[PDB]
Design a protein around this ligand. Structure first.
Ligand code: ATP
Ligand code: ATP
Ligand code: ATP
Ligand code: ATP
Ligand code: ADP
Ligand code: MG
Ligand code: MG
Lengths: 266, 266
């Protein structure tokens, strides 16, 4: 498996219909789940080093259509970290107070502190996604917002916040099956809403604006297009992406001023 | 396994030396962990109902000496919940801004919203624990702070915030072994701190101030004294305490405004 094949290279426009939704890297589900469990132990150790060092941060941004696995990826993969070192924000419809500020005001508030992992389940990119499809903003505004988003990510990068953006890529048939499973389950009815159907009738428009959003992929702030039809494969790929980032960040335990083997506990 | 025997009944003062630190209810680690795994599924389901209902909240407060298992309890038990529905705060030494306010200002800010589980890893009780042992405040101030804490918990209860306070109870010998394991393990040296030895020399003074703090136990805002020398037993007992609270709160899925069998997904 080469996860760099899922990275959007800078300057290369994405045509999503040419990107796989259903990869398995030749692995069975059981092999994939076992590898994910092993990576979870490494994710925990590297995140503990990140916290103890207190010099850098990691920001994971998740965007995806409804039912494409944002909630599941956070549970399964972000669940590998110590929850004391993680701040997860699920960005919903802007409140009245948030709308009275610039669109990055509420986003910047949640940028992670030194030593922490930040996770945006939805993010600044919502302001150039649904808002474009339903004509809440026009193209001129959307282009300007994408520029402001690039500048914001450059600001965080220079603050030693390592940025990873992940689009979970599922097929329309797979989304239909997952949405049907919500309708069928009385304990999941509360998660099906009329907007689900409206967004499906705008599937191709959403492709267009997601492909515009993916143009912010840079070497410092990459987008990944993760094939997510197989939930276990989504979790495996995301685990690799996050572990590669942490290993590259290479946090170190701080120096200590004593010899641990000589400490006497009474 | 009668969890209510660990509850501090109102007005019944605790003498911690008479409470066991190392119960196992006749279970092994394998047996206890299998029960905890089955309770985790039930915790996830009841927390999803709490969130979907959006009317009530759950607040878990943890206090314990260093190495007594706050971090582990949060990972193992709170990890059963969907992290999208949980807010964990690890309260550290008050900042200059926090000290310029009353002691409950920073605590009140983190009280949970409707639909959420809040976890205070340390809490308002720190202001009547370490502060008393080292004479940062006197008895008169400490008694007044305990009254304000009582009043604060009453305010949250009346807001349908279900309060559970948990003291993790370990023996001095157990703490010594766990601290030694930090000294012995290169990946854990960073968690050994000079305060560890100073507080041990003040073990009995801390018993006194914890027993005073435990007097805020009420039917509405109970303290539990959990035998925590066995880490798996700590997790089993805490799982029961939280599941009992959620089942009693009895959150209901909300009514929906459509017929799921009549929805047609194209
Ligand atoms: N800046 C924004 N402008 C408009 N809508 C936004 C913005 N940020 C988030 N939203 C919307 O808020 C809603 C949150 O809905 P909810 O928490 O119920 O999840 P959801 O419907 O399952 O979302 P998703 O479609 O991403 O899976 C989503 O429809 C999302 O598109
Ligand atoms: N158990 C839960 N506790 C708290 N919030 C939850 C829970 N289940 C779902 N939610 C929230 O309800 C909304 C709808 O859930 P949904 O399953 O669509 O999640 P999601 O994060 O949008 O993922 P997906 O990409 O699969 O749609 C989201 O805002 C999610 O955060
Ligand atoms: N209100 C408060 N006043 C003074 N000290 C406080 C207060 N709240 C928290 N603290 C202290 O902040 C410190 C946080 O330290 P740290 O995060 O390293 O954890 P720790 O040393 O493992 O804590 P613990 O002894 O609770 O296990 C603790 O020593 C705690 O007692
Ligand atoms: N992997 C981690 N990521 C983030 N914060 C961590 C991590 N490990 C420990 N911490 C924090 O560092 C401090 C010391 O850790 P420690 O293991 O003593 O935890 P704790 O919550 O105090 O538990 P205990 O009751 O066992 O002392 C605490 O503030 C803890 O929350
Ligand atoms: N698990 C326990 N371990 C040790 N002592 C306890 C425990 N539970 C209660 N006690 C002590 O026993 C005495 C009476 O407790 P109480 O809560 O009235 O018992 P119950 O309600 O079960 O009859 C008090 O001194 C109390 O501190
Ligand atoms: Mg969704
Ligand atoms: Mg500690």
């Amino acid at each position: 498996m080469d996860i760099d094949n899922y990275r959007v290279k800078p300057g290369k426009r994405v045509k999503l219909s040419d990107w796989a939704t259903n990869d398995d890297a030749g692995l069975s589900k059981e092999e994939g789940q076992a590898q994910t469990a092993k990576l979870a132990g490494e994710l925990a150790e590297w995140q503990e080093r990140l916290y103890a060092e207190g010099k850098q941060s990691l920001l994971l941004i998740l965007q995806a259509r409804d039912a494409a696995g944002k909630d599941g990826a956070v549970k399964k993969v972000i669940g590998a970290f110590n929850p004391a070192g993680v701040q997860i924000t699920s960005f919903k419809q802007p409140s009245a107070e948030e709308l009275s500020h610039d669109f990055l005001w509420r986003i910047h508030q949640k940028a992670p502190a030194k030593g922490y992992v930040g996770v945006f389940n939805r993010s600044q990119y919502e302001d150039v996604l649904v808002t474009r499809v339903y004509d809440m903003i026009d193209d001129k505004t959307a282009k300007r917002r994408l520029e402001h988003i690039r500048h914001f990510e450059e600001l965080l990068t220079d603050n030693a916040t390592r940025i990873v953006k992940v689009y979970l890529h599922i097929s329309p048939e797979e989304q239909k099956e997952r949405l049907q499973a919500r309708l069928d389950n009385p304990g999941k009815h509360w998660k099906f809403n009329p907007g689900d159907l409206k967004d499906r009738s705008n599937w191709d428009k959403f492709n267009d604006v997601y492909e515009d959003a993916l143009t912010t992929s840079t070497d410092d702030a990459p987008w990944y297009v993760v094939p997510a039809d197989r939930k276990w494969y989504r979790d495996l790929v995301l685990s690799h992406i996050l572990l590669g980032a942490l290993k590259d960040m290479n946090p170190q335990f701080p120096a200590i001023d004593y010899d641990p083997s000589k400490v006497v506990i009474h």
